[PDB]
Write a protein that binds this ligand. Structure first.
Ligand SMILES: *[C@@H]1O[C@H](CO[C@@H]2O[C@@H](C)[C@@H](O)[C@@H](O)[C@@H]2O)[C@@H](O[C@@H]2O[C@H](CO)[C@@H](O)[C@H](O)[C@H]2NC(C)=O)[C@H](O)[C@H]1NC(C)=O
Ligand SMILES: *[C@@H]1O[C@H](CO[C@@H]2O[C@@H](C)[C@@H](O)[C@@H](O)[C@@H]2O)[C@@H](O[C@@H]2O[C@H](CO)[C@@H](O)[C@H](O)[C@H]2NC(C)=O)[C@H](O)[C@H]1NC(C)=O
Ligand SMILES: *[C@@H]1O[C@H](CO[C@@H]2O[C@@H](C)[C@@H](O)[C@@H](O)[C@@H]2O)[C@@H](O[C@@H]2O[C@H](CO)[C@@H](O)[C@H](O)[C@H]2NC(C)=O)[C@H](O)[C@H]1NC(C)=O
Ligand SMILES: *[C@@H]1O[C@H](CO[C@@H]2O[C@@H](C)[C@@H](O)[C@@H](O)[C@@H]2O)[C@@H](O[C@@H]2O[C@H](CO)[C@@H](O)[C@H](O)[C@H]2NC(C)=O)[C@H](O)[C@H]1NC(C)=O
Ligand SMILES: *[C@@H]1O[C@H](CO[C@@H]2O[C@@H](C)[C@@H](O)[C@@H](O)[C@@H]2O)[C@@H](O[C@@H]2O[C@H](CO)[C@@H](O)[C@H](O)[C@H]2NC(C)=O)[C@H](O)[C@H]1NC(C)=O
Ligand SMILES: *[C@@H]1O[C@H](CO[C@@H]2O[C@@H](C)[C@@H](O)[C@@H](O)[C@@H]2O)[C@@H](O[C@@H]2O[C@H](CO)[C@@H](O)[C@H](O)[C@H]2NC(C)=O)[C@H](O)[C@H]1NC(C)=O
Ligand SMILES: *[C@@H]1O[C@H](CO[C@@H]2O[C@@H](C)[C@@H](O)[C@@H](O)[C@@H]2O)[C@@H](O[C@@H]2O[C@H](CO)[C@@H](O)[C@H](O)[C@H]2NC(C)=O)[C@H](O)[C@H]1NC(C)=O
Ligand SMILES: *[C@@H]1O[C@H](CO[C@@H]2O[C@@H](C)[C@@H](O)[C@@H](O)[C@@H]2O)[C@@H](O[C@@H]2O[C@H](CO)[C@@H](O)[C@H](O)[C@H]2NC(C)=O)[C@H](O)[C@H]1NC(C)=O
Ligand SMILES: CC(=O)N[C@H]1[C@H]([C@H](O)[C@H](O)CO)OC(C(=O)O)=C[C@@H]1NC(=N)N
Ligand SMILES: CC(=O)N[C@H]1[C@H]([C@H](O)[C@H](O)CO)OC(C(=O)O)=C[C@@H]1NC(=N)N
Ligand SMILES: CC(=O)N[C@H]1[C@H]([C@H](O)[C@H](O)CO)OC(C(=O)O)=C[C@@H]1NC(=N)N
Ligand SMILES: CC(=O)N[C@H]1[C@H]([C@H](O)[C@H](O)CO)OC(C(=O)O)=C[C@@H]1NC(=N)N
Ligand SMILES: [Ca+2]
Ligand SMILES: [Ca+2]
Ligand SMILES: [Ca+2]
Ligand SMILES: [Ca+2]
Ligand SMILES: [Ca+2]
Lengths: 388, 388, 388, 388
């Protein structure tokens, strides 16, 4: 017997530390590795796992040509041991998906898997390996979800879902799902948030989600959610913005609205509220998906004149390609430890990655209440060595 | 301790949804994948699994040349994680077989494995990994079985077996097997059914099997069976036929006899009785093994003037190759969920598949009481990229 | 908790049936498969396993050239799922060995592993993964053992071991080992047996071993052993001999001495006593390692004028290569089922196998009290397709 | 429930015996095997495991070129089944590391993983898969650790760590870690030891560590440690030295100070105290990393005029390449069995290994209270067959 996961507080932390790294592109030089993108990490009672949307092809084969394409019937959510490259001999196929979320509720895994036509997609809910429920596209425009782990509290899992156009008004919802059965949903209030997608969520008593506004906000939209309802919404107050593209530091403090500058197209990212402060992941570049750093902004969670970047950890240099990033948690004793992954995209459309495919490797970091050192942990592939 | 599976009713459902897809041919471009055909799916308490008849060769190697051939000593029933491509690093070999069935009784797996000479084949019964019993060919003409999962009720498993010619009178039996020991068999009554093979079965209180008449019936033969005996037999009443080849819709309503038109050679397929209605899988083409759709026919299970196709889901376009299809079930709480797989055959003798081998990938769908979206989930291989 | 295996009788049987087949050479065409020889099978509570002496090289690579060689430091006993080809992604390395035996005592696995110099080899005893004891070569001439499964009764395992020359007088012993600790050994009486090696053993209340005389006996030497001592010895009385080479049928009935004809070099083989009768495996050829058949000889276990071959099953045609064969058992309820494997050697020095390496595949059969069909289950490799 | 490992005495032993060997370089000829170095072995309740620092590349691929380099962001501690070659289909990635230690406390695994910049590295402590603590470089000069298994007593694990220059005064510490949390550390006393790194440790009631002085000592520094503190320190008294390089036998008896001759650069090695005697591993060559032998020196642990090499086992000939070696233990009933591994380095900078990469295979031996035979168990690769 295992109990459902509880509403634990986030553990104390003062810096982030290198955890697992798969080096998947380097290891894929001889065409062993499955083409992926939109990876993430999620853990059960016994293991943390890598997840990613595979492309139904091996890296460097003819079928990998053109895998920049976002949605195909040949994409599946796959799972593989954390920090290992995904290969045919180690992967598990979770469901057919070109958008996904996964989370463990203390007893079983839940997955949310979108596939099908852009104008008529459906999300399949998997629980304990069984398809238990589904969501039918209601705006008929690329029904989609987090691309990182959802969160579960006392047996009820919470997941953010979007249907509708990019860079215009769309529908944003949270779904509450228990043992694979949809209990209810809520349309996210639009009093503050104007656009939300690709939420990166964690638990600190309640579920916090920090997401991607691909329309008018260079600042990130966020929600606080419990097992019953959405409790609060906003944009991250920090005058230092964390989407990509975005304005140079310092920019506007916008707690209640999109920054109305450099709003599109954005990238999936994450942050962690800490007291009145906030930690924010972001690309080093303000324009492109290169580099990765994480900053701590004093009073960055609140309306304040005192925002300052107290800490900056540079984890992937600006000379290296990054991509999506997302939060995951690991249960410590009586608190949840904040961790995150960074997708390191290689191939199209990256400048000078002269290959026909698009894929990624993974690197991960976890938070400790200790002072970190410094380093650089990029993809590390010599793109010239690779099968094109 | 685990109890034997019970005689549960089928769960309510109103459409089918994409589950797992292996993309095995695409992933086999670099010769990692085992050549297979006649795949199916079956689940135990903890996992669903892919099964298939391997050909003792890797796809695209010289030994894969000529694998259109149905029966060789080098064919084995293999098992691999559901939705994964079968590779040497992930497969398990269950038994030597060129025809098979597998099912889990709640405690252990049973398999039925035919191999040997066409005129002197034997079926090996495996239970919990041990060879426990066997069936000796009695008509001496390709003793053979379902090529999809059998069914077990309160510890007694039921499996359909045929011995004798194709497109002429043969012998059809059901065998009852408990803990791997043959309890009894029955010759299927020929009052209605004139030919039966390759049964696709599921549980809805009793076992229902919908099978393949390769002789005079474009409609599918069926049986209702319990833990002791065959209870009913017939052909599916639906005036919309579901074998391949078959007449164009609408055709004859034949509840009690073969349609006596477009009877051969047929293809393995499946259906689900639902009240007085019936769901039927079928190729899109009325002549060839291309496309896959599933229809719901109002009152299609009974003798009625009111048959109509209330629903048609097109899951694989007619421009794509299909093949065999079969039912499997997944235990929900107090009901069994209806699912099915579709074999996507590539290679010989398919027109324009210019390779020397014959193999397949898999796609699967499960039934939910929700409205589906729409999509297309074909093999997806560019046959031109493949090692011939 | 699991009890130690008990002294069960052999189950009734009247023929042998195809079980698992790995097709390892066919599947090794693309250099994925580990080079092996001297395979065997042994089972624990939950699985049967393939074992073999690997050669520390992949089939078809430059390091596989010359693997006809019997003993090197690069040979390890490896284990892989039964009926699968041994590959880097599925194998386990048990110990360094160029001669081995393995058996499961009901709780844990024991292995006996010989390696080192011909004139100073030692056998390592492994129990539950730990090296627990050892045997030092005492005749200083290729200390060696069964190359098939040993047997364990009420926690005491029995294994036959030889040290000394081939085709001359050597030392033969049985060792009793409990939880990996050597309890005692006995020098095999030489009142009847003149040479013994490579014993194939099973349990029928007591342990029976049928072995290889590589000196003067075309008939096979045998022993009956319990948890304490050797109880009986002899040669198989059957006037139909079962070593290779051997005289044509019928030959001499020699219950108490080597036949004194066609004695060398012999091949590992097996048999099963059944009442006063005996089942004997043997190559089809009387001179070479080609084909495989199993015969039942009426009264073949005893001194009698009534020996006759009541049954002959031809399992591998004489046009196909065979090799070693050995017994293993599978617990049925209150009896042990007799099974056997056949090593199918390909490569050097086989005539017309034009490659530089030597390896093998595996096929297995189990006994049932049912009438068998007929078939042929050879290696199946087109040696011309293989990397040399 | 499993108890924490106890302070057991070392088991009696009088020689070492071949255990597991992976033949990883031979098996890597077709580019399947992960490039590694600094391997070791450590066991839990159910299995012994191989560990090594991978290089984020497959052997023989372009990314393997230049892997002589010691520290990169693409190095991870990986785990794979003992005696198997590390491949993508069997490995687990434990953490990002270019220096590591691992040990099992009876309940869970702990790992210590150093990565990042040379002048600002940090060690991540992993316990039960979760990052639980860390050590920040304090001398800012390649914070580093054992490269073999740590040891745990009654739930408290002990690990030796160094920060500072090579061939000059550095800082050496022991850390005590419980359930992944650092309890305390101690600076190693410098009353006797002048330099310590790469400790090879085992348990004999207390923890004994025999390490590498890379400065002034051709004799090896050692410590005796319990769950609370460092109890004793010294250099191995044996007038026969065991670092590499070192003086020819016999050299100085230096129980309390470095030999002050042939002190650098040294190699990781191990030994076992036995009564007043000591067993010492060492390369056969006194100058290079070739060959491997283990000696027993009578009274070699103490100050005595009676040191003599009572036993010499030559396990890898001087014509073969060796490398690092380290101790590990296996629980026997009420004692710990002493075992060790030897890293067999191939590639740069080894003379005549004409390839661009640097990697290794593994061989292992365990101690028994029996007389051994003799043999030779080198890497066995024909470097000429390998992809460069
Ligand atoms: C949602 O969970 C609560 C229990 O969790 C607490 O309340 C949540 C709203 C949130 O604030 C958490 O952080 C809190 O820890 C459930 O409330 C329980 O309901 C049962 C049955 O009525 C009752 O016996 C308990 O006393 C309640 N527990 C508490 C602490 O109030 C609530 O039922 C959950 N809602 C759903 C829809 O599952
Ligand atoms: C990646 O693929 C492109 C496109 O390939 C073509 O279209 C595909 C859908 C498929 O049908 C292929 O068979 C086609 O070749 C390649 O670009 C083509 O290259 C060919 C051969 O040099 C050239 O004749 C065409 O004009 C190109 N077509 C286009 C639209 O650019 C490209 O070479 C592939 N990249 C790699 C690294 O192989
Ligand atoms: C077959 O199973 C029945 C129990 O299942 C019920 O009866 C079947 C025929 C079928 O209609 C199912 O859907 C039903 O749920 C067994 O009947 C039991 O037998 C035992 C022993 O005699 C008796 O104690 C119980 O009362 C019976 N149970 C019921 C509900 O009647 C029957 O034994 C099974 N037959 C075989 C050969 O195994
Ligand atoms: C697939 O195999 C066929 C047949 O191969 C021949 O017969 C086999 C049983 C085996 O013995 C092979 O060695 C033989 O080559 C191939 O067709 C043959 O191709 C060869 C060479 O071009 C030609 O000389 C023969 O006439 C052909 N034989 C026949 C009966 O057609 C075919 O090329 C193979 N396909 C692929 C993609 O390689
Ligand atoms: C060997 O096993 C016997 C028990 O097995 C029986 O005797 C064997 C010799 C063999 O004939 C088997 O087939 C039989 O089933 C052990 O005898 C037991 O010893 C214990 C302790 O003295 C005693 O309490 C039991 O009564 C004995 N059991 C019987 C049936 O006699 C014997 O100890 C074993 N010897 C060793 C060395 O382990
Ligand atoms: C299998 O190997 C033999 C022998 O290889 C030679 O000796 C080995 C130990 C090793 O040192 C190799 O590098 C040597 O090549 C091969 O036979 C040799 O082939 C070469 C090249 O054609 C020839 O010059 C030598 O005379 C041969 N030596 C002998 C003793 O025959 C043989 O070709 C290999 N087989 C295959 C299929 O590659
Ligand atoms: C360290 O372990 C001891 C128990 O182990 C013994 O003492 C060690 C110092 C070492 O000498 C071992 O080989 C010995 O076996 C712990 O001592 C126990 O402490 C508890 C709580 O105070 C007490 O109830 C027991 O009586 C003590 N046991 C003994 C045998 O003295 C000690 O607590 C451990 N220290 C730490 C920091 O964990
Ligand atoms: C191993 O690599 C070296 C170096 O490769 C060069 O530098 C690397 C960092 C990378 O940028 C590569 O693309 C470069 O080629 C190889 O040595 C080079 O070989 C090339 C081609 O022959 C030659 O023109 C350069 O002068 C060489 N550079 C140096 C510094 O020596 C070497 O060939 C590789 N080894 C193998 C076995 O391939
Ligand atoms: C469902 C879907 O296709 N989501 C997209 C996504 C999307 O286009 C934008 O967020 C706008 O809505 O962006 C990104 C892109 O890297 O920005 C990759 C995704 N790829 C996949 N999830 N497959
Ligand atoms: C035992 C056997 O060989 N069964 C056949 C089968 C058969 O020929 C017909 O159903 C007529 O009886 O049809 C099909 C074919 O795709 O229609 C493939 C099978 N291949 C295998 N099961 N191996
Ligand atoms: C230890 C050893 O090398 N045993 C031999 C063996 C042996 O030479 C004879 O039985 C004579 O004693 O025969 C055979 C051979 O196939 O006949 C293969 C073996 N190969 C291995 N077991 N590695
Ligand atoms: C952390 C680190 O880089 N340690 C080194 C090491 C080191 O340079 C010396 O011991 C001197 O301090 O020596 C050796 C070398 O083989 O002697 C390999 C190591 N490689 C790795 N552990 N990655
Ligand atoms: Ca934005
Ligand atoms: Ca038909
Ligand atoms: Ca003989
Ligand atoms: Ca491969
Ligand atoms: Ca030194």
């Amino acid at each position: 017997f295992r109990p459902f996961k509880s509403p634990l507080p986030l553990c104390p932390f003062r810096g982030f530390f290198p955890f697992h790294k798969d080096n998947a592109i380097r290891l894929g030089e001889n065409k062993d590795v499955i083409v992926t993108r939109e990876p993430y990490v999620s853990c059960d009672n016994d293991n943390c796992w890598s997840f990613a949307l595979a492309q139904g092809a091996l890296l460097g084969t003819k079928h990998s040509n053109g895998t920049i394409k976002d949605r195909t019937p040949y994409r599946s959510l796959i799972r593989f041991p954390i920090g290992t490259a995904p290969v045919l001999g180690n992967y598990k196929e979770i469901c057919i998906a070109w958008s996904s979320s996964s989370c463990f509720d203390g007893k079983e895994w839940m997955h949310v898997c979108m596939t099908g036509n852009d104008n008529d997609a459906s999300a399949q809910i998997i629980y304990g390996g069984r398809m238990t429920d589904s969501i039918k596209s209601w705006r008929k425009d690329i029904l989609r979800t987090q691309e990182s782990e959802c969160q579960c509290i006392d047996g009820t899992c919470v997941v953010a879902v979007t249907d509708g156009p990019a860079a215009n008004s769309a529908d944003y919802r949270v779904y509450w799902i228990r043992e694979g059965k949809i209990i209810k949903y809520e349309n996210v209030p639009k009093t503050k948030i104007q656009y939300l997608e690709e939420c990166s969520c964690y638990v600190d008593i309640d579920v916090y989600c920090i997401c991607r506004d691909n329309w008018k906000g260079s600042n990130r939209p966020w929600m606080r959610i419990n097992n019953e309802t959405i409790l609060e919404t906003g944009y991250v107050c920090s005058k230092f913005h964390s989407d990509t593209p975005r304005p140079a530091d310092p920019s506007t403090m916008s707690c209640d609205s999109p920054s109305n500058v450099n709003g599109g197209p954005g990238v999936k990212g994450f942050g962690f509220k800490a007291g009145d402060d906030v930690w924010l992941g972001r690309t080093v570049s303000t324009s492109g998906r290169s580099g990765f750093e994480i900053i701590k902004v004093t009073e960055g969670w609140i309306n304040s004149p005192n925002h300052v970047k107290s800490i900056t950890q540079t984890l992937v240099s600006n000379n290296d390609w990054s991509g999506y990033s997302g939060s995951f948690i690991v249960k410590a004793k009586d608190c949840f430890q904040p961790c995150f992954y960074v997708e390191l995209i290689r191939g199209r459309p990256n400048k000078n990655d002269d290959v026909s495919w698009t894929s990624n490797s993974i690197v991960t970091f976890c938070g400790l209440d200790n002072e970190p050192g410094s380093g650089n942990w990029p993809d590390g592939s010599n793109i010239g060595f690779m099968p094109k």
